[PDB]
Enzyme design. Sequence first.
Site, PDB file in Angstrom:
ATOM      1  N   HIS A 144       0.890  -1.267   0.141  1.00  0.00           N
ATOM      2  CA  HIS A 144       0.029  -0.008   0.035  1.00  0.00           C
ATOM      3  C   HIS A 144       0.968   1.181   0.108  1.00  0.00           C
ATOM      4  CE1 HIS A 144       0.298   0.400   4.516  1.00  0.00           C
ATOM      5  NE2 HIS A 144      -0.064   1.866   4.241  1.00  0.00           N
TER       6      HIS A 144
ATOM      7  N   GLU B 159      19.129   6.627   8.983  1.00  0.00           N
ATOM      8  CA  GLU B 159      18.329   7.891   9.480  1.00  0.00           C
ATOM      9  C   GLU B 159      18.078   7.848  11.061  1.00  0.00           C
ATOM     10  OE1 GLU B 159      17.953  10.827   8.049  1.00  0.00           O
ATOM     11  OE2 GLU B 159      17.370  10.892   6.244  1.00  0.00           O
TER      12      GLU B 159
ATOM     13  N   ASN C 137      17.108  11.749  12.557  1.00  0.00           N
ATOM     14  CA  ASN C 137      16.015  12.839  12.284  1.00  0.00           C
ATOM     15  C   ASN C 137      15.766  12.955  10.697  1.00  0.00           C
ATOM     16  OD1 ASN C 137      15.162  15.485  11.744  1.00  0.00           O
ATOM     17  ND2 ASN C 137      15.620  16.559  13.508  1.00  0.00           N
TER      18      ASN C 137
ATOM     19  N   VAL D  64      17.043  16.844   9.163  1.00  0.00           N
ATOM     20  CA  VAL D  64      18.590  16.939   9.505  1.00  0.00           C
ATOM     21  C   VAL D  64      19.643  16.071   8.939  1.00  0.00           C
ATOM     22  CG1 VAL D  64      20.258  17.806  11.329  1.00  0.00           C
ATOM     23  CG2 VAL D  64      17.783  18.367  11.559  1.00  0.00           C
TER      24      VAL D  64
ATOM     25  N   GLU E 104      23.494   8.838   7.095  1.00  0.00           N
ATOM     26  CA  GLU E 104      22.598   8.769   6.199  1.00  0.00           C
ATOM     27  C   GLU E 104      23.365   7.968   4.765  1.00  0.00           C
ATOM     28  OE1 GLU E 104      22.720  11.378   7.653  1.00  0.00           O
ATOM     29  OE2 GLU E 104      20.959  12.110   8.345  1.00  0.00           O
TER      30      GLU E 104
ATOM     31  N   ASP F 108      -0.349  -7.908   1.600  1.00  0.00           N
ATOM     32  CA  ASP F 108       0.469  -6.054   1.739  1.00  0.00           C
ATOM     33  C   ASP F 108       1.783  -6.367   1.803  1.00  0.00           C
ATOM     34  OD1 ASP F 108       0.314  -3.415   1.950  1.00  0.00           O
ATOM     35  OD2 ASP F 108      -0.261  -3.294   3.894  1.00  0.00           O
TER      36      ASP F 108
ATOM     37  N   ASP G 234      -0.202   2.139  19.520  1.00  0.00           N
ATOM     38  CA  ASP G 234      -0.402   1.438  18.380  1.00  0.00           C
ATOM     39  C   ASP G 234       0.670   2.146  17.069  1.00  0.00           C
ATOM     40  OD1 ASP G 234      -1.852   0.090  15.967  1.00  0.00           O
ATOM     41  OD2 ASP G 234      -3.466   1.687  16.202  1.00  0.00           O
ATOM     42  N   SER G 235       0.851   1.525  16.047  1.00  0.00           N
ATOM     43  CA  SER G 235       1.636   2.055  14.940  1.00  0.00           C
ATOM     44  C   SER G 235       0.466   3.055  14.411  1.00  0.00           C
ATOM     45  CB  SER G 235       2.016   1.040  13.941  1.00  0.00           C
ATOM     46  OG  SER G 235       1.203   0.240  13.381  1.00  0.00           O
TER      47      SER G 235
ATOM     48  N   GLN H 276      -0.654   5.974  10.374  1.00  0.00           N
ATOM     49  CA  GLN H 276      -0.223   6.301   9.089  1.00  0.00           C
ATOM     50  C   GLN H 276       1.205   6.866   9.208  1.00  0.00           C
ATOM     51  OE1 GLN H 276      -4.048   6.036   9.775  1.00  0.00           O
ATOM     52  NE2 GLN H 276      -3.488   7.750  10.861  1.00  0.00           N
ATOM     53  N   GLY H 277       2.006   6.289   8.152  1.00  0.00           N
ATOM     54  CA  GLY H 277       3.250   6.836   8.074  1.00  0.00           C
ATOM     55  C   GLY H 277       4.371   5.912   8.582  1.00  0.00           C
TER      56      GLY H 277
ATOM     57  N   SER I 120       3.578   2.957   8.188  1.00  0.00           N
ATOM     58  CA  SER I 120       3.242   1.884   7.140  1.00  0.00           C
ATOM     59  C   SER I 120       4.591   1.303   6.366  1.00  0.00           C
ATOM     60  CB  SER I 120       2.497   2.497   6.123  1.00  0.00           C
ATOM     61  OG  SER I 120       1.630   3.474   6.599  1.00  0.00           O
ATOM     62  N   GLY I 121       4.513   0.010   6.012  1.00  0.00           N
ATOM     63  CA  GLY I 121       5.451  -0.534   5.326  1.00  0.00           C
ATOM     64  C   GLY I 121       6.709  -0.808   6.456  1.00  0.00           C
TER      65      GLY I 121
HETATM   66 CA   LIG Z   1      18.900  12.823   8.874  1.00  0.00          CA
END
Ligand SMILES: [Ca+2]
Length: 223
Positions: free
Chosen positions: A40, A52, A54, A57, A62, A84, A171-172, A174-175, A177-178
């Site tokens: 999804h 990652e 932040n 920033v 990264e 899914d 809970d987890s 929106q965002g 997700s995955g």
């Molecule tokens: Ca960063």
Amino acid sequence: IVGGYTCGANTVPYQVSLNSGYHFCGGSLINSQWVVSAAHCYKSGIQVRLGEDNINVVEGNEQFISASKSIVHPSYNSNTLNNDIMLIKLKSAASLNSRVASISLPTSCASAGTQCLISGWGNTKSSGTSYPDVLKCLKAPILSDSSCKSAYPGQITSNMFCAGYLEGGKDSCQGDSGGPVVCSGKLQGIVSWGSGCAQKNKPGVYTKVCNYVSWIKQTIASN
Ligand SMILES: [Ca+2]
């Protein structure tokens, strides 16, 4: 993640942020060239951000690597959200160390009662909106199949499991997700759906990864 805590920078080394101009979903590094996420979350033009904490920033750890291809599960259904799960091959292999590492795939499915770590940069409010800049973490038990089927009658397939709290408030969301659900160091789930976030008697539902191991290994060996 609603009602979670700040993980702390690079304490979750397999966590990835998927970006198409902005963070939109999470995912999990399973080897130096492949990410698993939720179907999804599919879109074209995904850049995978590794290392990652932040996401606004650049802090020094990264790796931003574009994807070469995205593969949605052959039997994904977007209306029921069954199957899914999606694979993302990276254009270059990532460089793995303690702050960026892969997670093992399960040999056996996890039992209800097992406590898992769920993490991501999704919404932190149950009503209203607030998206954090640093990664959030939630520990949550896998519920029994009968609490799960009784909370979502007619909705749970064999490829889905619930995890969380029937009393709500954690809970987890929106965002996330995955993103990963890790239990005893193995990836057991993918943040998939729920009714709102952190509602009473509405726990999170997660794609059951141990059902997908042969498709994941076969796809990786041929692509
Ligand atoms: Ca960063």
